[PDB]
Write a protein that binds this ligand. Structure first.
Ligand SMILES: CC(C)(C)c1nc[nH]c1/C=c1\[nH]c(=O)/c(=C/c2cccc(C(=O)c3ccc(F)cc3)c2)[nH]c1=O
Ligand SMILES: Nc1nc2c(ncn2[C@@H]2O[C@H](COP(=O)(O)OP(=O)(O)O)[C@@H](O)[C@H]2O)c(=O)[nH]1
Ligand SMILES: [Ca+2]
Ligand SMILES: [Mg+2]
Lengths: 57, 424
């Protein structure tokens, strides 16, 4: 039982840690993905601005 | 039945156990390197009880030294009589037991127990007629308490017909290393109730008070407590270590002291108490050894009744006067001796006095007042256990709360059993 509980604690610490570090990488990447997607939306807007100058002449 | 195998376990066990071999080696004329330099043939007549004979006519104690850390056993080997012990009998682990019964009994000590039993078997093998085992330990720590009781349970399996006796030092807040002592002691008491034939209840409370009140030592060390212990250890082994027309072994003595199998916890005592010039008279020895102040277990014998008493007087005195004085205290205090065991006080005299004293007396009392000792440790236990305090140290090593609940109940049963014969 001493071994069983000592192993359980090591097991669940390792699984709790791996779940957090993977959940964190998902969240950080998704936060950076949204930031770039908003910045890439400005490039698509700036392309419509430059087209509406040439298509008005 | 001549040979006894001695085992000393833990810091305490090895400390008082070292003092035992210091005192008796002096009494038998054995020097620090093992050679005989006595004068009386009585010193060699029953030397086989505690010593093996070696080449060059050397005497080696039949002694096994156990601990879960090297520390204290390195101090034994360095100490005054440490060279006399057989090097193979020093059996020790490395990690210690942190005053933890569970470590001693179930994890750390389990790893070391079998190699201790190999040394026991080695000693028991070359024994013409092994009478039994004796053990020195504390019940308050981890090794002596937890492993010492584990050894006692293993020894009983392999040697179920041999006598198991212990000197078991009981913990007290007055001389206290850790708050978990009551836990360790309660777990150990249940083991001794099952697996020992006699247990000498050395109470550190009592040894402290004797050092403080009746010896005027303001700051008593463990050596001052151990001085009182070794005087008693010598006293209880006198009738086996010498003659004098007494035809008794550990079993014969056990048969006459223990009327009920579970009630084998004795109240040791010694007169005179020392730390002298005027030798005591026989009446003084008798009054002192029966006095509560001289008791090595902090109980009041007036609060119980004596089931049996044994007293062994050392020195050159009148056996007529001993008989008279021993009969005087019984017949003048007959309420405190049970009427339903006739002639329950027995006595012996040995001509050889111990070192320093011209005449002494060692008291072995099987009184029902020892319930006070077990009640005190039961109260300390429950104070913590009702809040499950400090249990994590034990559950971490695999133990359940159930085992504590059992042990609490087993000792309270012992107390109830002592109360039964006190009112009968
Ligand atoms: C007639 C007369 C008075 C002799 C008598 N009639 C009934 N009884 C008696 C006396 C004795 N009865 C005993 O049962 C006895 C027990 C005994 C013997 C040896 C060792 C240990 C022992 O636990 C020990 C000692 C040192 C140690 F390190 C670890 C353990 C106990 N000694 C006695 O002198
Ligand atoms: N009388 C006496 N008691 C001791 C001695 N050493 C430790 N103790 C007591 O024993 C208990 C501690 O156990 P200890 O033997 O040090 O632990 P272990 O080495 O793990 O068995 C405490 O209750 C102390 O009061 C000693 O030399 N003499
Ligand atoms: Ca280990
Ligand atoms: Mg200690």
């Amino acid at each position: 039982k001493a071994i069983e509980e000592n192993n359980n604690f090591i097991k669940m610490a390792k699984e709790k840690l791996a779940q957090k570090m993977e959940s964190n990488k998902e969240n950080r990447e998704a936060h950076l993905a949204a930031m770039l997607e908003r910045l890439q939306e400005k490039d698509k807007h700036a392309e419509e601005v430059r087209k509406n100058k040439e298509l008005k002449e | 039945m001549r040979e006894i195998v001695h085992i000393q376990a833990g810091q305490c066990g090895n400390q008082i156990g070292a003092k035992f071999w210091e005192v008796i080696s002096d009494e038998h004329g054995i020097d620090p390197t093992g050679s005989y330099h006595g004068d009386s043939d009585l010193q060699l007549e029953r030397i086989n009880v505690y010593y093996n004979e070696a080449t060059g006519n050397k005497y080696v104690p039949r002694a096994i030294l156990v601990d879960l850390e090297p520390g204290t056993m390195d101090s034994v080997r360095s100490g005054p009589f440490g060279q006399i012990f057989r090097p193979d009998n020093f059996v020790f682990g490395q990690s210690g037991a942190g005053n933890n019964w569970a470590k001693g009994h179930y994890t750390e000590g389990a790893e070391l127990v079998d190699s201790v039993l190999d040394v026991v078997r080695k000693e028991s093998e070359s024994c013409d007629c092994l009478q039994g085992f004796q053990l020195t330990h504390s019940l308050g720590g981890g090794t002596g308490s937890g492993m010492g009781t584990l050894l006692i349970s293993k020894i009983r399996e392999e040697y179920p017909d041999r006598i198991m006796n212990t000197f078991s030092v009981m913990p007290s807040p007055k001389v206290s290393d850790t708050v978990v002592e009551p836990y360790n002691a309660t777990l150990s008491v249940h083991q001794l109730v099952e697996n020992t034939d006699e247990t000498y209840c050395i109470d550190n409370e009592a040894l402290y008070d004797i050092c403080f009140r009746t010896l005027k030592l303001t700051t008593p060390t463990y050596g001052d407590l151990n001085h009182l212990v070794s005087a008693t250890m010598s006293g209880v082994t006198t009738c086996l270590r010498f003659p004098g027309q007494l035809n008794a072994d550990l079993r014969k003595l056990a048969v006459n002291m223990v009327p009920f199998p579970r009630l084998h916890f004795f109240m040791p005592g010694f007169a005179p108490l020392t730390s002298q010039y005027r030798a005591l008279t026989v009446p003084e020895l008798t009054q002192q050894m029966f006095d509560s102040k001289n008791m090595m277990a902090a109980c009041d014998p007036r609060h119980g009744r004596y089931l049996t008493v044994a007293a062994i007087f050392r020195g050159r005195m009148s056996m007529k006067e001993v008989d008279e004085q021993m009969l005087n205290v019984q017949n003048k205090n007959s309420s405190y001796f049970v009427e339903w065991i006739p002639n329950n006080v027995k006595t012996a005299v040995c001509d050889i006095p111990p070192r320093g004293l011209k005449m002494s007396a060692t008291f072995i009392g099987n009184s029902t007042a020892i319930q006070e000792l077990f009640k005190r440790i039961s109260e300390q236990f429950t104070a913590m256990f009702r809040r499950k305090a400090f249990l994590h140290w034990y559950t971490g090593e695999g133990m359940d709360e159930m085992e504590f609940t059992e042990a609490e109940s087993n000792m309270n049963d012992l107390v109830s059993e002592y109360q039964q014969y006190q009112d009968a």
